[PDB]
Each structure stands twice: as structure tokens, then as C-alpha cells.
Design a protein around this motif. Structure first.
Motif, PDB file in Angstrom:
ATOM      1  N   UNK A  54     -68.366  57.886  52.647  1.00  0.00           N
ATOM      2  CA  UNK A  54     -68.097  58.460  53.960  1.00  0.00           C
ATOM      3  C   UNK A  54     -67.221  57.529  54.790  1.00  0.00           C
ATOM      4  N   UNK A  55     -65.940  57.461  54.439  1.00  0.00           N
ATOM      5  CA  UNK A  55     -64.997  56.605  55.150  1.00  0.00           C
ATOM      6  C   UNK A  55     -64.392  57.338  56.343  1.00  0.00           C
ATOM      7  N   UNK A  56     -64.951  57.094  57.525  1.00  0.00           N
ATOM      8  CA  UNK A  56     -64.454  57.737  58.727  1.00  0.00           C
ATOM      9  C   UNK A  56     -63.315  56.971  59.367  1.00  0.00           C
ATOM     10  N   UNK A  57     -62.088  57.402  59.096  1.00  0.00           N
ATOM     11  CA  UNK A  57     -60.907  56.747  59.650  1.00  0.00           C
ATOM     12  C   UNK A  57     -60.743  57.080  61.129  1.00  0.00           C
ATOM     13  N   UNK A  58     -60.351  56.083  61.915  1.00  0.00           N
ATOM     14  CA  UNK A  58     -60.155  56.269  63.348  1.00  0.00           C
ATOM     15  C   UNK A  58     -59.029  55.384  63.869  1.00  0.00           C
ATOM     16  N   UNK A  59     -57.881  55.995  64.144  1.00  0.00           N
ATOM     17  CA  UNK A  59     -56.727  55.262  64.650  1.00  0.00           C
ATOM     18  C   UNK A  59     -56.449  55.612  66.108  1.00  0.00           C
ATOM     19  N   UNK A  60     -56.846  54.721  67.010  1.00  0.00           N
ATOM     20  CA  UNK A  60     -56.640  54.935  68.438  1.00  0.00           C
ATOM     21  C   UNK A  60     -55.279  54.407  68.877  1.00  0.00           C
ATOM     22  N   UNK A  61     -54.603  55.167  69.752  1.00  0.00           N
ATOM     23  CA  UNK A  61     -53.283  54.794  70.271  1.00  0.00           C
ATOM     24  C   UNK A  61     -53.348  53.595  71.210  1.00  0.00           C
ATOM     25  N   UNK A  62     -52.564  52.565  70.904  1.00  0.00           N
ATOM     26  CA  UNK A  62     -52.546  51.373  71.732  1.00  0.00           C
ATOM     27  C   UNK A  62     -51.198  51.140  72.384  1.00  0.00           C
ATOM     28  N   UNK A  63     -50.973  49.907  72.862  1.00  0.00           N
ATOM     29  CA  UNK A  63     -51.962  48.828  72.767  1.00  0.00           C
ATOM     30  C   UNK A  63     -53.166  49.066  73.673  1.00  0.00           C
ATOM     31  N   UNK A  64     -54.018  48.052  73.794  1.00  0.00           N
ATOM     32  CA  UNK A  64     -55.206  48.151  74.631  1.00  0.00           C
ATOM     33  C   UNK A  64     -54.832  48.256  76.106  1.00  0.00           C
ATOM     34  N   UNK A  79     -58.378  50.382  74.981  1.00  0.00           N
ATOM     35  CA  UNK A  79     -58.579  51.573  74.163  1.00  0.00           C
ATOM     36  C   UNK A  79     -59.468  52.582  74.882  1.00  0.00           C
ATOM     37  N   UNK A  80     -60.605  52.111  75.386  1.00  0.00           N
ATOM     38  CA  UNK A  80     -61.524  52.986  76.089  1.00  0.00           C
ATOM     39  C   UNK A  80     -62.900  53.013  75.455  1.00  0.00           C
ATOM     40  N   UNK A  81     -63.038  52.340  74.316  1.00  0.00           N
ATOM     41  CA  UNK A  81     -64.312  52.291  73.607  1.00  0.00           C
ATOM     42  C   UNK A  81     -64.995  50.942  73.810  1.00  0.00           C
ATOM     43  N   UNK A 112     -59.927  60.868  77.157  1.00  0.00           N
ATOM     44  CA  UNK A 112     -58.919  59.826  76.994  1.00  0.00           C
ATOM     45  C   UNK A 112     -58.678  59.528  75.517  1.00  0.00           C
ATOM     46  N   UNK A 113     -57.850  58.524  75.250  1.00  0.00           N
ATOM     47  CA  UNK A 113     -57.536  58.134  73.881  1.00  0.00           C
ATOM     48  C   UNK A 113     -58.806  57.805  73.104  1.00  0.00           C
ATOM     49  N   UNK A 114     -59.863  57.454  73.828  1.00  0.00           N
ATOM     50  CA  UNK A 114     -61.138  57.118  73.206  1.00  0.00           C
ATOM     51  C   UNK A 114     -61.854  58.370  72.712  1.00  0.00           C
ATOM     52  N   UNK A 115     -62.357  59.168  73.647  1.00  0.00           N
ATOM     53  CA  UNK A 115     -63.063  60.396  73.306  1.00  0.00           C
ATOM     54  C   UNK A 115     -62.158  61.355  72.539  1.00  0.00           C
ATOM     55  N   UNK A 116     -60.904  61.447  72.968  1.00  0.00           N
ATOM     56  CA  UNK A 116     -59.938  62.326  72.321  1.00  0.00           C
ATOM     57  C   UNK A 116     -59.750  61.949  70.855  1.00  0.00           C
ATOM     58  N   UNK A 117     -60.216  60.760  70.490  1.00  0.00           N
ATOM     59  CA  UNK A 117     -60.099  60.282  69.118  1.00  0.00           C
ATOM     60  C   UNK A 117     -61.385  60.534  68.338  1.00  0.00           C
TER      61      UNK A 117
END
Length: 103
Positions: free
Chosen positions: A5-15, A17-19, A40-45
Motif C-alpha cells: 500500500x504505497x500511498x504517493x503524495x506530492x505536494x506543490x512547493x516550495x514550503x 506546505x500546510x501539513x 489548500x495544497x495540503x487538504x487538496x492533496x
């Protein structure tokens, strides 16, 4: 996937981030999210407070303590690649998304 179960998560940066982060290999606890920025980029991700940070920016946290994560997350790239275990029932799970990687 099949391997795990590899959950990939690429958030848009730079910082930023929101997490947030909680725990650490030093505190004998997995690096999970404390809170996610609503809308935001956090939840939206597809981010949520509870996921397990298996690896940061494509770098496992085998020897990365909470304090280190702060220096490993801020020094990230235009985009932060956080690999989650996507294990909601990560309470008494005997196993967890391994996600190996040769060196």
C-alpha cells in the motif's frame, strides 16, 4: 497496488506546505500528520491527520527523528514527496507498507 500500500503524495512547493507532523523515530512513534490545511495544497492533496510518513521527499525516515524531519522537510524540493502507509487501521497492524528501495 500489488506489492504493498504505497500511498504517493506530492505536494506543490516550495514550503510552506500546510501539513503538520507528530511523533518520531526518536520518540518511539511514527511521523504522522497533526493537522491539515482546510482548502489548500495540503487538504487538496488528499492529506489527513493520522497518516504515517514512511518516507520524506523520497527518503525513508529510518534514521530521521522529529527534529530531523523539520530540517528534511524545509530543505525539500519544489515538491515534497511524502510516502504514506494509507493504513487507517494503523492501531494494531502487525505489518505496514514496506516500500523498499535499493541504494
Amino acid at each position: 497496488g500489488s506489492s504493498g500500500s504505497s500511498g504517493n503524495v506530492v505536494l506543490p512547493g516550495p514550503a510552506p506546505w500546510g501539513f503538520r507532523l507528530s511523533g518520531g523515530i526518536d520518540f518511539n512513534q511514527p511521523l504522522v500528520i497533526t493537522r491539515i490545511t482546510p482548502g489548500s495544497k495540503a487538504a487538496a492533496a488528499n492529506l489527513c491527520p493520522g497518516d504515517v510518513i514512511l518516507a520524506i521527499d523520497g527518503f525513508g525516515t529510518e534514521s530521521m527523528t522529529h527534529a530531523d524531519a523539520q530540517d528534511r522537510i524545509k530543505a525539500a524540493s519544489y515538491q515534497l514527496c511524502l510516502k504514506i502507509d494509507r493504513a487507517e487501521t494503523r492501531l494494531w497492524s502487525p505489518q505496514v507498507s514496506s516500500g523498499p528501495s535499493s541504494g
